[PDB]
Amino acid sequence: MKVGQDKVVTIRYTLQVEGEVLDQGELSYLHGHRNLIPGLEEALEGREEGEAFQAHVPAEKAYGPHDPEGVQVVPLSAFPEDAEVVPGAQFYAQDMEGNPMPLTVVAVEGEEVTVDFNHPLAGKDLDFQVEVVKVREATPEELLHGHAHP
């Protein structure tokens, strides 16, 4: 069974940016519904179960470019009082539609805390070693929901 539309695909992957490997894992995802970065998805389309390969995905095709307008500053008022505001910590805020917008705090300067709304991998190209371990037809319920059930 080959990777294709409406098939739940389980793969294990190693990620390298520039030359540094930054993560390794196993994931299953539903193919064809925008659940996986496009460049990866395009590499996987058609692969037969068992195939193993290397894939290079430019930033535009994975997480996009870094947007300068995505880095902003808000008072420490906004952060919770129990909370630790330290470089690296991650929080969410609320958009006008009401939906959460996540951020990673970049710097704290007294009253002013600067945060970054970009994806952490924005602007960085990615290198992958990938193993396709299983492709299965999707379940009706996965199809109504839009996601593989983990």
Binding site: E69, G70, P80, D82, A83, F91, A93, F117
Partner: peptide, 11 residues
């Protein structure tokens, strides 16, 4: 970009 008068929430 876009921000609201609502406080952030922990990880």
């Amino acid at each position: 970009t876009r921000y609201a008068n609502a406080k952030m929430l922990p990880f």
